[PDB]
């Protein structure tokens, strides 16, 4: 279990996700963006499974729902992430 908190920038949170192509498959961090919030923070790493976002469990959500909740965060607001590796 890994817990972090990232601030939303105009360029995003600084990471890419994969998975969630059907409601039964979990999501994963595919890449970290150079000089992005995820990377300066240094706690997330490629292959990490996304468990929850702002206390909301995302294991069971589609890749589309999760992208939506990440893009739904206003610039400057922060997000609490729980990841498993």
């Amino acid at each position: 279990s890994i817990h972090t908190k990232l601030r939303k920038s105009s360029r995003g949170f600084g990471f890419t996700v994969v998975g969630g192509d059907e409601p039964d498959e979990f999501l994963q961090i595919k890449s970290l963006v150079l000089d992005g919030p995820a990377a300066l923070d240094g706690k997330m790493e490629t292959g990490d499974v996304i468990v929850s976002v702002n206390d909301t469990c995302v294991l069971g959500h589609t890749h589309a729902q999760v992208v939506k909740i990440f893009q739904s965060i206003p610039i400057g607001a922060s997000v609490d992430l729980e990841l498993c590796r």
Partner: peptide
């Protein structure tokens, strides 16, 4: 290569 979305 599966779908990879930046956020």
């Amino acid at each position: 290569r599966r779908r990879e979305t930046q956020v």
